[PDB]
Scaffold this active site. Structure first.
Site: not given
Length: 181
Positions: A119-121, A127
């Site tokens: 995941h990322c933001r 990601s």
């Protein structure tokens, strides 16, 4: 890599000059590999319901473009954590992390019960780049095929620098005969 990057952008775009945003917080993009946003990363009950065993935070940090989690956050949950403090800029050398990330995904999937959230933001640039690189490096998919399968399962848009890095990786793997024809 301008031509090659443009080819990848043409597979992502919506034909009005725009790129669809994610329609859900989290998607299983290939079997046992999930890509998602900050909200899902910080929702341990949800992760437990999906059966997530491993979390790779590709936006670790303290700003509004980062996700301020750590091993501690996941301590009681039995989830194994790795963080990469990447920024979503064309200048950020995410390719320096492709091996480490691919190793972490491999660590998660090597046992048949494992399930990893990368995941990322927003689950849009950082990601998905790491997942695509993993599919290239570990599943012998060329970049176009890997990007296409991920995009079929989640709206993504890696920045052009990340796409150039994936094109460089694809060249190297193709040269070394590590991609499936």
């Amino acid at each position: 890599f301008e031509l090659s990057v443009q080819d990848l952008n043409d597979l992502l775009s919506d034909g009005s000059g725009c790129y669809s945003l994610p329609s859900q917080p989290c998607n299983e993009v290939t079997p046992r590999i999930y890509v998602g946003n900050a909200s899902v990363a910080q929702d341990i009950p949800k992760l437990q319901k999906l059966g997530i065993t491993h979390v790779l935070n590709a936006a670790e940090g303290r700003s509004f473009m980062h996700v301020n989690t750590n091993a501690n956050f996941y301590k009681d949950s039995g989830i194994t954590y790795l963080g990469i403090k990447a920024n979503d800029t064309q200048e950020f050398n995410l390719s320096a992390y492709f091996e480490r990330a691919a190793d972490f995904i491999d660590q998660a999937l090597a046992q048949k019960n494992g399930r990893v959230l990368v995941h990322c933001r927003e689950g849009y640039s950082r990601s998905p780049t790491l997942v695509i690189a993993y599919l290239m490096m570990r599943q012998k998919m060329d970049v176009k095929s890997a990007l296409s399968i991920v995009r079929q399962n989640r709206e993504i848009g890696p920045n052009d620098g990340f796409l150039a890095q994936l094109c460089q990786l694809n060249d190297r793997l193709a040269k070394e005969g590590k991609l499936k024809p």
